[PDB]
Design a protein around this motif. Sequence first.
Motif, PDB file in Angstrom:
ATOM      1  N   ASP A  92       6.302   1.670 -13.651  1.00 39.68           N
ATOM      2  CA  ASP A  92       5.423   1.802 -12.064  1.00 39.68           C
ATOM      3  C   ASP A  92       5.382   3.651 -11.730  1.00 39.68           C
ATOM      4  O   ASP A  92       6.307   4.729 -12.146  1.00 39.68           O
ATOM      5  CB  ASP A  92       7.534   1.839 -11.066  1.00 39.68           C
ATOM      6  N   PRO A  93       3.993   3.548 -11.497  1.00 35.99           N
ATOM      7  CA  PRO A  93       3.580   4.941 -12.111  1.00 35.99           C
ATOM      8  C   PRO A  93       4.532   5.777 -10.908  1.00 35.99           C
ATOM      9  O   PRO A  93       3.570   7.319 -11.101  1.00 35.99           O
ATOM     10  CB  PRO A  93       2.298   4.433 -11.172  1.00 35.99           C
ATOM     11  N   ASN A  94       4.527   5.752  -9.772  1.00 37.19           N
ATOM     12  CA  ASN A  94       5.877   6.234  -8.808  1.00 37.19           C
ATOM     13  C   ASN A  94       7.022   7.111  -9.835  1.00 37.19           C
ATOM     14  O   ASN A  94       7.550   8.525  -9.806  1.00 37.19           O
ATOM     15  CB  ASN A  94       5.860   6.173  -7.545  1.00 37.19           C
ATOM     16  N   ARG A  95       7.441   6.545 -10.067  1.00 38.91           N
ATOM     17  CA  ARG A  95       8.568   6.436 -11.671  1.00 38.91           C
ATOM     18  C   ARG A  95       8.542   7.090 -12.634  1.00 38.91           C
ATOM     19  O   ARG A  95       7.021   6.921 -13.137  1.00 38.91           O
ATOM     20  CB  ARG A  95       9.322   4.785 -11.744  1.00 38.91           C
ATOM     21  N   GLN A 143      -2.311   4.483  -6.646  1.00 38.70           N
ATOM     22  CA  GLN A 143      -1.212   3.824  -7.273  1.00 38.70           C
ATOM     23  C   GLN A 143      -0.972   3.002  -6.271  1.00 38.70           C
ATOM     24  O   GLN A 143      -0.711   3.699  -4.712  1.00 38.70           O
ATOM     25  CB  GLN A 143       0.064   4.876  -7.415  1.00 38.70           C
ATOM     26  N   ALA A 144      -0.344   2.174  -6.434  1.00 40.19           N
ATOM     27  CA  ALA A 144       0.846   1.291  -5.079  1.00 40.19           C
ATOM     28  C   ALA A 144       2.167   1.097  -5.533  1.00 40.19           C
ATOM     29  O   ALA A 144       2.415   0.720  -6.440  1.00 40.19           O
ATOM     30  CB  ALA A 144       0.355   0.210  -5.774  1.00 40.19           C
ATOM     31  N   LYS A 168       1.142  -1.168  -0.127  1.00 37.44           N
ATOM     32  CA  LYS A 168      -0.319  -0.409   0.426  1.00 37.44           C
ATOM     33  C   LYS A 168       0.875   1.163  -0.343  1.00 37.44           C
ATOM     34  O   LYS A 168       2.101   1.306   0.399  1.00 37.44           O
ATOM     35  CB  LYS A 168      -0.874   0.087   1.444  1.00 37.44           C
ATOM     36  N   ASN A 169       0.456   2.157  -0.848  1.00 43.35           N
ATOM     37  CA  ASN A 169       0.948   3.914  -1.035  1.00 43.35           C
ATOM     38  C   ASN A 169       0.238   4.621  -0.726  1.00 43.35           C
ATOM     39  O   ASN A 169      -0.481   5.440  -2.039  1.00 43.35           O
ATOM     40  CB  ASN A 169       1.784   3.782  -1.976  1.00 43.35           C
ATOM     41  N   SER A 170      -0.646   4.990   0.603  1.00 42.27           N
ATOM     42  CA  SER A 170      -1.781   5.585   1.154  1.00 42.27           C
ATOM     43  C   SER A 170      -1.180   7.198   0.591  1.00 42.27           C
ATOM     44  O   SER A 170      -0.202   7.740   1.001  1.00 42.27           O
ATOM     45  CB  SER A 170      -2.581   6.039   2.342  1.00 42.27           C
TER      46      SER A 170
END
Lengths: 46, 271
Positions: free
Chosen positions: B83-86, B59-60, B35-37
């Motif tokens: 990776d949505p964060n990257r 996103q996770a 999880k990444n709230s």
Amino acid sequence: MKRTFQPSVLKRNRSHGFRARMATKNGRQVLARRRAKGRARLTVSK
Amino acid sequence: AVVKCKPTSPGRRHVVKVVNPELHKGKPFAPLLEKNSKSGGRNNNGRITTRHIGGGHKQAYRIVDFKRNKDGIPAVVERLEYDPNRSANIALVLYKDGERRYILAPKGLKAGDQIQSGVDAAIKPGNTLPMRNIPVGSTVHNVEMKPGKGGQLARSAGTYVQIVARDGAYVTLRLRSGEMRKVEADCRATLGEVGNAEHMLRVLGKAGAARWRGVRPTVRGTAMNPVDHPHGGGEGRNFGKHPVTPWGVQTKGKKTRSNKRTDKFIVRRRS
RNA sequence: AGGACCGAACCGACUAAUGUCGAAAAAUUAGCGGAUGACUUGUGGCUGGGGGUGAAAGGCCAAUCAAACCGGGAGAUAGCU
RNA sequence: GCUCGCCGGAAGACCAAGGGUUCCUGUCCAACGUUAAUCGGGGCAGGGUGAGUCGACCCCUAAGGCGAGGCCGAAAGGCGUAGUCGAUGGGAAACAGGUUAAUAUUCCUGUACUUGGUGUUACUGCGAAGGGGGGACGGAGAAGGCUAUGUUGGCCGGGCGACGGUUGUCCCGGUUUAAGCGUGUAGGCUGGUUUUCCAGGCAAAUCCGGAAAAUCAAGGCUGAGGCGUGAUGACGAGGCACUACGGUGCUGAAGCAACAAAUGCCCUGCUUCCAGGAAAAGCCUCUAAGCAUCAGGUAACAUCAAAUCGUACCCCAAACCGACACAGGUGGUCAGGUAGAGAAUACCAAGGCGCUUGAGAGAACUCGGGUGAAGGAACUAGGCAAAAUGGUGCCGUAACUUCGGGAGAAGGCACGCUGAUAUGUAGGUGAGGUCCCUCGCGGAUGGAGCUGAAAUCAGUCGAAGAUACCAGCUGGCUGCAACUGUUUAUUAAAAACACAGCACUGUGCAAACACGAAAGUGGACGUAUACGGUGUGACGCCUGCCCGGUGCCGGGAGGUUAAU
RNA sequence: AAUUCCUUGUCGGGUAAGUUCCGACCUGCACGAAUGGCGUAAUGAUGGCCAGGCUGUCUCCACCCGAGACUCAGUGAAAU
RNA sequence: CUUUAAUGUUUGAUGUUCUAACGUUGACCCGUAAUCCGGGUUGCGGACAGUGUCUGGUGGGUAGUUUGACUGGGGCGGUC
RNA sequence: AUAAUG
RNA sequence: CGCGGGGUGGAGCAGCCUGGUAGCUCGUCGGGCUCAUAACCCGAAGAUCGUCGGUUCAAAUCCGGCCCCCGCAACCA
């Protein structure tokens, strides 16, 4: 018009309630003022 | 290929998507997910800190293998993943032992390619080995600030660091900013340039484009009232004030780099 | 495919009339704008008084905001009515 | 009681939120209701809330709150680990019919179902805050298979009818039936079984993961609905019976077919796209610490237990929120006939009401509106307000452009009914029969029945056939902003704000910066194609000249310079 | 010209007649190239202006239908 | 006394190397089924950095306030 | 190295 | 109408706050250089200071009025 007070017993109990006051010293001051006031209603309750 | 969208509808005229056909079309390897709230940019105090962020698509977080702790173990990449964060793409490497961990994807990588890690490894790109067997001047990335740290420098897409000098245990490096700095030789590094260098080419193309990135629109200070911002005021976009941050710290030319203790590592200043 | 088109629910509040002891301490009527999206909303939280929040009006924070409310200094002070 | 009228995507029927007996009955009426009141959400009295299956409680978890030690802080306290709270989530299980003045999936009747405890019997290795699998997931779009439900036909029952016809191609009414259980379909996914080895899964492992062969080509999972059972039961129109004239007792025929059809289901799918799309427990499986004549685990049967709380009524409102019995605000569910693309809208069914002052007069004037000769913006700050434009099919459509537009440009034609083509077509659906077969909810052939546009031709009626409601004014020049959006709730919806884009500047991570006396977080579980800040505001052509003053930056000789 | 004082500048167009609008003349009171300069398709409950169409907006209002005003009965305010 | 050379003693001004202070939001182990924290090894820095005392400078981010009167009203001008 | 014009 | 500045050879500018005796570039005039002009070279002339009055021994200088020019102000219903 949408009145500013929309009722909700749960949110009222979680903030204006007894336990919400007991959670901190500031609320205990409030209850101390209530008992000093002599009012029959210490806190809102069912 | 970086296809340009047709202006069939308004707000699509300027959109320039960067298509990546090589990416897998399927669900991510489940166990590594966690999880990444969203924080909203608020702190533990709950007051705002990093302004104009938050929101956007859910996103996770992926547990990418920074440390590359495995040594001498042969491996073959299974499938590319986004990776949505990257900004950079990640690869789901399949180790010979069968363990799976995501890693940063080198620009020279394809499905079924073989890679390995350890002090030996190979000069072939994508391998991760400590900075001592590395030839001088070779491109490297995912540099560790300290040994065992995992990964730090040049992990962003299109970014890479090149060796310039090797002072014994010290290893001088040319950072992408051009700010030269030495690092410990023991620190591990992955060979080759980082992939997805085309990510910069994207230009969003619409007003709502910031909104799913978690970016929020920024209000100009002149638009703000004097009570809220140092600038602003007047009856007609009046200015004449020296530019500043809302808290009053100088902007457009105000260096704030003074850790002092870390300055010794620095060699040449950015220019 | 679309912060795409028409057009209900829903939302938004532009014109005029009605109404300003009004039915209502901001409406209704007849026409509008948005309506697969930077959409809307239900539920529960987090951020608060020199602070919060603010696609920025100096707005909004219990019908009160160029500094909320309550209580206490306090029978403040006022060359003034 | 007989008629009229209103909503009928509600102005109806069920809930939640929220009220707290407003619910039903008896009785009374001063006060409450803007009127009278034998009426009532009013007074008084009595009665009414029935759960293993619904919900809550409960197991578990998100944001987030508290917080054993700990860290920090003058005190108060702040932060936060293990933990434990927190449903707006996930987690075992009930339907049909009937009954009360007021309560029911809660009672009754019928038919079941699930999670645990105990006992017996037949067998077996069981066993963690541990591992793995599962739980377990996005937007959008498309098509298929069905259902809810409707219509028609048939059947059954009744009527044949107070002005003309009406035993017929006729009229009215009924044609309703679940959970569960059995079968396992349309459809969707995955190649299975057997054996070996192994730095993988903080220890271990038969589980998972990976590497090898062996060997066959299917097996298995998921899955609406259908058909049987449930059900020779219940329900059922109408008669037959008793009336304190409120209703009760009894009886009870047919209960099929075809077609249309969902936003509902299969679908927590398939496809596509990017913005890559919770957590944990219940569940399945594998071991350790352990324990074996045990304890346990599995199967069958018997038996016991499932406690506690909510259950009335309102619930888009005179019962909630609005000081009112107030043209307001309030989330979810069910959802029909005709016309229509439509949840628009018009008229209706079920159902609920006529809105708690009326009766006359028919003045000015005010408001809600209809029509109006001639002129048609001559009005006025201003085409404000009204009028008008208004649908479908087709023809046709410029300047300009970023080549998508403009555009629904503009501007016209065809719209009714009936018949013929065609004793209703194209199409859709699909029975009987025939035939194949590794026999089923089958695959072909076959086409009855049913449903059914659109177009052409001919005829005819009206002044008017998009005839009602519904339902764009358009074109040209130009300022501005690219555009979508957003704002002063309650006089300012804009040229402002924001905007993608562009540029400068800050920052090598213990990042700048930000909150916080501090710790710690945010940035970010990101880090130089990253981010913060400022300016500008798509795009197209571009973006000069000036460092004196001021701001910033670099340099350090010297003059000067405080603490010491 | 959202900047233009003098001023309703001047020339030309539209109207019978135009302090506005469009185009142009530059004497720019007091534009100016990222507090951007100049254009620009699409878009607009945006500003100005013109035409067709349409109308009681008006010339000039007239009539009719309903809710009030009015009368009777019942209840019964307000500011001042 | 002046001017100066060698060594010792006494201290200051620098440039390098070293570890024991200290920093460690490096790694591993334990408390511990807890990434907090603490403890133990070891790695990289290292008398830097950081905080405290004192002081110089910058300092509208913030706070407390000032900004006179006369005036044929006010302000401008002028005057005290 | 500088020299315009007729 | 208010405040501030300015008026000097033909032209554009110093001196005009500490009043004794007005310079600069260009132009003009004369002589050279070129076959000639422009330029260059050398030499010379030219203004009693906007005009009109006052102190002062004496005024381009200080003071005052008038005649001009220029910047700015000309505000709050």
